[PDB]
Amino acid sequence: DPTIIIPKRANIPTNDLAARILRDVKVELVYNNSLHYVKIRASVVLDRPAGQSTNAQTPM
Amino acid sequence: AYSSTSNIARMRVPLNQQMFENRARTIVTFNATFVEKDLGTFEDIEHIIIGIDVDNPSG
């Protein structure tokens, strides 16, 4: 989530008070990513595929 | 003004060792108000001077 942080008055230097300008407001964001490339792995079978594993447990 | 009165006591007082004299006594309380005059005055305020200091951060 975006974050916004603003300093308190106690943390503002004397020169900044004299110039009447506030510094050090900090923001933070994250960005999405459009998809460019994709790769696939096909597999073809000609004969009868063999029986699968029958270990019907809950995989640890 | 008048305020109140006390008990009235009757008394007999011997005189010359022969006779008793009749008497009485009482206390009457009054209100009053007294006024007195001062012995001078202070000076007036003709001129007033005030100094002001405005603390600020710009200077």
Side-chain angles (χ1 to χ4, degrees), chain A residues 4-17:
Chain A
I4 309 177
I5 292 157
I6 287 136
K8 294 142 287 282
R9 184 179 170 109
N11 319 113
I12 309 185
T14 55
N15 286 36
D16 287 1
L17 260 53

PDB file of all heavy atoms in Angstrom, chain A residues 4-17:
ATOM      1  N   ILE A   4       2.639   7.593   3.218  1.00  0.00           N
ATOM      2  CA  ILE A   4       2.861   9.033   3.276  1.00  0.00           C
ATOM      3  C   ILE A   4       3.336   9.356   4.686  1.00  0.00           C
ATOM      4  O   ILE A   4       2.723   8.919   5.665  1.00  0.00           O
ATOM      5  CB  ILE A   4       1.597   9.833   2.932  1.00  0.00           C
ATOM      6  CG1 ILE A   4       1.005   9.343   1.609  1.00  0.00           C
ATOM      7  CG2 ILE A   4       1.921  11.314   2.845  1.00  0.00           C
ATOM      8  CD1 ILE A   4      -0.286  10.026   1.229  1.00  0.00           C
ATOM      9  N   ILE A   5       4.423  10.115   4.791  1.00  0.00           N
ATOM     10  CA  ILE A   5       5.007  10.490   6.072  1.00  0.00           C
ATOM     11  C   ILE A   5       5.267  11.988   6.072  1.00  0.00           C
ATOM     12  O   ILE A   5       5.837  12.527   5.117  1.00  0.00           O
ATOM     13  CB  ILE A   5       6.307   9.708   6.343  1.00  0.00           C
ATOM     14  CG1 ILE A   5       5.994   8.231   6.572  1.00  0.00           C
ATOM     15  CG2 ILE A   5       7.035  10.288   7.542  1.00  0.00           C
ATOM     16  CD1 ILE A   5       7.164   7.319   6.295  1.00  0.00           C
ATOM     17  N   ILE A   6       4.854  12.656   7.143  1.00  0.00           N
ATOM     18  CA  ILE A   6       5.010  14.104   7.270  1.00  0.00           C
ATOM     19  C   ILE A   6       5.709  14.410   8.591  1.00  0.00           C
ATOM     20  O   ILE A   6       5.307  13.877   9.634  1.00  0.00           O
ATOM     21  CB  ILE A   6       3.651  14.814   7.180  1.00  0.00           C
ATOM     22  CG1 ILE A   6       3.145  14.799   5.741  1.00  0.00           C
ATOM     23  CG2 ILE A   6       3.754  16.242   7.686  1.00  0.00           C
ATOM     24  CD1 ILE A   6       1.691  14.450   5.623  1.00  0.00           C
ATOM     25  N   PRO A   7       6.742  15.246   8.605  1.00  0.00           N
ATOM     26  CA  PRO A   7       7.431  15.540   9.864  1.00  0.00           C
ATOM     27  C   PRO A   7       6.616  16.447  10.772  1.00  0.00           C
ATOM     28  O   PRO A   7       5.732  17.183  10.332  1.00  0.00           O
ATOM     29  CB  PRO A   7       8.715  16.237   9.403  1.00  0.00           C
ATOM     30  CG  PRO A   7       8.351  16.865   8.117  1.00  0.00           C
ATOM     31  CD  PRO A   7       7.377  15.931   7.465  1.00  0.00           C
ATOM     32  N   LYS A   8       6.927  16.376  12.062  1.00  0.00           N
ATOM     33  CA  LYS A   8       6.322  17.266  13.037  1.00  0.00           C
ATOM     34  C   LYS A   8       7.094  18.580  13.099  1.00  0.00           C
ATOM     35  O   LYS A   8       8.150  18.741  12.485  1.00  0.00           O
ATOM     36  CB  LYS A   8       6.288  16.615  14.418  1.00  0.00           C
ATOM     37  CG  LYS A   8       5.374  15.401  14.511  1.00  0.00           C
ATOM     38  CD  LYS A   8       5.958  14.309  15.393  1.00  0.00           C
ATOM     39  CE  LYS A   8       7.124  13.599  14.723  1.00  0.00           C
ATOM     40  NZ  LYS A   8       6.659  12.619  13.707  1.00  0.00           N
ATOM     41  N   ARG A   9       6.549  19.537  13.855  1.00  0.00           N
ATOM     42  CA  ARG A   9       7.209  20.832  13.969  1.00  0.00           C
ATOM     43  C   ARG A   9       8.530  20.727  14.719  1.00  0.00           C
ATOM     44  O   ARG A   9       9.470  21.470  14.420  1.00  0.00           O
ATOM     45  CB  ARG A   9       6.296  21.839  14.666  1.00  0.00           C
ATOM     46  CG  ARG A   9       6.893  23.233  14.729  1.00  0.00           C
ATOM     47  CD  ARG A   9       5.969  24.218  15.409  1.00  0.00           C
ATOM     48  NE  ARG A   9       6.640  25.485  15.675  1.00  0.00           N
ATOM     49  CZ  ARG A   9       6.392  26.626  15.047  1.00  0.00           C
ATOM     50  NH1 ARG A   9       5.480  26.713  14.092  1.00  0.00           N
ATOM     51  NH2 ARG A   9       7.077  27.714  15.387  1.00  0.00           N
ATOM     52  N   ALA A  10       8.620  19.821  15.694  1.00  0.00           N
ATOM     53  CA  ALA A  10       9.835  19.721  16.495  1.00  0.00           C
ATOM     54  C   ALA A  10      11.062  19.399  15.653  1.00  0.00           C
ATOM     55  O   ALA A  10      12.185  19.668  16.091  1.00  0.00           O
ATOM     56  CB  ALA A  10       9.659  18.658  17.578  1.00  0.00           C
ATOM     57  N   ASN A  11      10.878  18.839  14.461  1.00  0.00           N
ATOM     58  CA  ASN A  11      11.980  18.373  13.635  1.00  0.00           C
ATOM     59  C   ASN A  11      12.347  19.346  12.520  1.00  0.00           C
ATOM     60  O   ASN A  11      13.086  18.964  11.606  1.00  0.00           O
ATOM     61  CB  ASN A  11      11.629  17.016  13.024  1.00  0.00           C
ATOM     62  CG  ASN A  11      10.933  16.101  14.008  1.00  0.00           C
ATOM     63  OD1 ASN A  11       9.758  15.772  13.843  1.00  0.00           O
ATOM     64  ND2 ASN A  11      11.653  15.689  15.042  1.00  0.00           N
ATOM     65  N   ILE A  12      11.855  20.576  12.564  1.00  0.00           N
ATOM     66  CA  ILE A  12      12.072  21.558  11.505  1.00  0.00           C
ATOM     67  C   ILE A  12      13.185  22.500  11.949  1.00  0.00           C
ATOM     68  O   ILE A  12      13.079  23.096  13.026  1.00  0.00           O
ATOM     69  CB  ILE A  12      10.786  22.346  11.186  1.00  0.00           C
ATOM     70  CG1 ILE A  12       9.626  21.373  10.955  1.00  0.00           C
ATOM     71  CG2 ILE A  12      10.991  23.203   9.948  1.00  0.00           C
ATOM     72  CD1 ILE A  12       8.338  22.032  10.519  1.00  0.00           C
ATOM     73  N   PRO A  13      14.258  22.658  11.172  1.00  0.00           N
ATOM     74  CA  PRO A  13      15.366  23.514  11.616  1.00  0.00           C
ATOM     75  C   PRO A  13      15.010  24.993  11.626  1.00  0.00           C
ATOM     76  O   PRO A  13      14.022  25.433  11.029  1.00  0.00           O
ATOM     77  CB  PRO A  13      16.470  23.230  10.589  1.00  0.00           C
ATOM     78  CG  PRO A  13      16.088  21.962   9.932  1.00  0.00           C
ATOM     79  CD  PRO A  13      14.602  21.916   9.949  1.00  0.00           C
ATOM     80  N   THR A  14      15.854  25.763  12.319  1.00  0.00           N
ATOM     81  CA  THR A  14      15.618  27.197  12.455  1.00  0.00           C
ATOM     82  C   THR A  14      15.667  27.901  11.106  1.00  0.00           C
ATOM     83  O   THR A  14      14.855  28.794  10.836  1.00  0.00           O
ATOM     84  CB  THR A  14      16.650  27.806  13.402  1.00  0.00           C
ATOM     85  OG1 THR A  14      17.968  27.486  12.941  1.00  0.00           O
ATOM     86  CG2 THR A  14      16.467  27.261  14.806  1.00  0.00           C
ATOM     87  N   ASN A  15      16.624  27.535  10.252  1.00  0.00           N
ATOM     88  CA  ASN A  15      16.690  28.137   8.927  1.00  0.00           C
ATOM     89  C   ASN A  15      15.461  27.815   8.094  1.00  0.00           C
ATOM     90  O   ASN A  15      14.974  28.689   7.368  1.00  0.00           O
ATOM     91  CB  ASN A  15      17.950  27.674   8.201  1.00  0.00           C
ATOM     92  CG  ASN A  15      19.200  28.336   8.730  1.00  0.00           C
ATOM     93  OD1 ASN A  15      19.320  28.598   9.927  1.00  0.00           O
ATOM     94  ND2 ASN A  15      20.143  28.616   7.839  1.00  0.00           N
ATOM     95  N   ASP A  16      14.949  26.590   8.177  1.00  0.00           N
ATOM     96  CA  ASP A  16      13.710  26.250   7.499  1.00  0.00           C
ATOM     97  C   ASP A  16      12.529  27.052   8.023  1.00  0.00           C
ATOM     98  O   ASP A  16      11.699  27.502   7.226  1.00  0.00           O
ATOM     99  CB  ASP A  16      13.420  24.755   7.642  1.00  0.00           C
ATOM    100  CG  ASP A  16      14.330  23.905   6.781  1.00  0.00           C
ATOM    101  OD1 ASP A  16      15.194  24.477   6.086  1.00  0.00           O
ATOM    102  OD2 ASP A  16      14.181  22.663   6.796  1.00  0.00           O
ATOM    103  N   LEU A  17      12.433  27.250   9.338  1.00  0.00           N
ATOM    104  CA  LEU A  17      11.391  28.134   9.856  1.00  0.00           C
ATOM    105  C   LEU A  17      11.550  29.551   9.325  1.00  0.00           C
ATOM    106  O   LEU A  17      10.559  30.185   8.948  1.00  0.00           O
ATOM    107  CB  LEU A  17      11.411  28.149  11.382  1.00  0.00           C
ATOM    108  CG  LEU A  17      10.370  27.277  12.078  1.00  0.00           C
ATOM    109  CD1 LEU A  17      10.422  25.855  11.564  1.00  0.00           C
ATOM    110  CD2 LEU A  17      10.590  27.309  13.578  1.00  0.00           C
TER     111      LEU A  17
END
